[PDB]
């Protein structure tokens, strides 16, 4: 091969979290929402097969799979935790997926709600032609 290529795509992870003015009967003090998206509302579904949110073990059904945009989870709870997020690619070759450990932190009563954004850049060195055309459609 004479030529080679590196394709770069941008992801945006983030979450919002707001103190409820009255906790639920379970003691859930917060409503929060975590998401994975592209910037400028770009269509990352062109190359994203699914997004898996691994919630803390205390949750029921902690494996939350989003096969279509929006890639997000909305929940109520009482404490922050590390949230591993797996972004699976429409790619038979490697890399098959990528992983981010997302800090889902919550703020105290009386303070502003959490609004956090994490920008991540992915680089794919010499993808297959089929995966490359998907990456470039995004």
């Amino acid at each position: 091969m004479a030529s080679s290529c590196a394709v770069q795509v941008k992801l945006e992870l983030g979450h919002r979290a707001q103190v409820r003015k009255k906790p639920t009967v379970e003691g859930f003090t917060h409503d929060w929402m975590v998401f994975v998206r592209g910037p400028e509302h770009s269509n990352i579904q062109h190359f994203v097969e699914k997004v898996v949110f691994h919630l803390h073990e205390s949750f029921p059904r902690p494996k939350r799979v989003c096969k279509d945009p929006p890639y997000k989870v909305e929940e109520s709870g009482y404490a922050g935790f590390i949230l591993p997020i797996e972004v699976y690619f429409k790619n038979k070759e490697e890399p098959r997926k990528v992983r981010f450990d997302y800090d889902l932190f919550l703020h105290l009563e009386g303070h502003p709600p959490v609004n956090h954004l994490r920008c991540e850049k992915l680089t794919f060195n010499n993808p297959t032609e089929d995966f490359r055309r998907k990456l470039l459609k995004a």
Binding site: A79, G80, F81
Partner: peptide, 8 residues
């Protein structure tokens, strides 16, 4: 700033 407890 200050944050809640964590699942721990």
């Amino acid at each position: 700033t200050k944050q809640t407890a964590r699942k721990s």
